[PDB]
C-alpha cells in the first residue's frame, strides 16, 4: 500500500531526530570533558529502531519483482491484438461508411 511510503518518511524523520540528539550529546561532552566516551542508550536504541523500520519500509518501496519466464505477461495476449500491425493500418473498411463521415 501507499502508507509504506509514509512509513519510510517518519523513519527518516526519526533518524534526523537522532542526529540532533547526538549533536546535543556531543556538546555535552564538549562542556563536560569527562571520561564518559559513550552515547546514551536511548539515542542508540532509537537510531537502531529507526534504521530497522526505515529499511523494512524501503524494501517495500523498492517495488515488485518481475518474472523471468517470457511467457508470463504474454499469456493473456489474445490473437485479436497481435494481428493489428499499427503501422500497416488501412482505412478502406466498413467502419467509415457505417459510422458518421
Amino acid at each position: 500500500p501507499s502508507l509504506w511510503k509514509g512509513l519510510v518518511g517518519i523513519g527518516l524523520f526519526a533518524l534526523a531526530h537522532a542526529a540532533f540528539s547526538a549533536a546535543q550529546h556531543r556538546s555535552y561532552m564538549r562542556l563536560t570533558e569527562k571520561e564518559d566516551e559513550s552515547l546514551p542508550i536511548d539515542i542508540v536504541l532509537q537510531t537502531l529502531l529507526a534504521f530497522a523500520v526505515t529499511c523494512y519500509g524501503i524494501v517495500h518501496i523498492a517495488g515488485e519483482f518481475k518474472d523471468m519466464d517470457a511467457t508470463s505477461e504474454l499469456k493473456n495476449k489474445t490473437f485479436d491484438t497481435l494481428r493489428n500491425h499499427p503501422s500497416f493500418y488501412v482505412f478502406n473498411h466498413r467502419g467509415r461508411v457505417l459510422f458518421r463521415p
Binding site: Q24, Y28, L31
Partner: protein, 50 residues
C-alpha cells in the same frame, strides 16, 4: 602598578547561558529509557522555544 608584573595565569571564562544547561541534564543516568526520552524531548522543546 602594572608596570612590574611578577606572575600571571589565564583562567577560562564561565560557561554562557545558552550552554549552561548542557552540563546539568547530563549525568542523571535514569534506569528507565522512558525517563531519558522524556527529558531529552523536554530539552528539545526548550531549545525549540528558545
Amino acid at each position: 602598578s602594572l608596570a612590574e608584573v611578577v606572575c600571571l595565569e589565564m583562567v577560562d571564562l564561565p560557561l554562557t547561558g545558552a550552554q549552561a544547561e548542557l552540563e546539568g541534564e547530563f549525568g542523571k543516568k535514569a534506569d528507565g529509557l522512558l525517563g531519558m526520552f522524556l527529558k531529552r524531548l523536554s530539552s528539545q522543546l526548550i531549545l525549540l522555544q528558545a
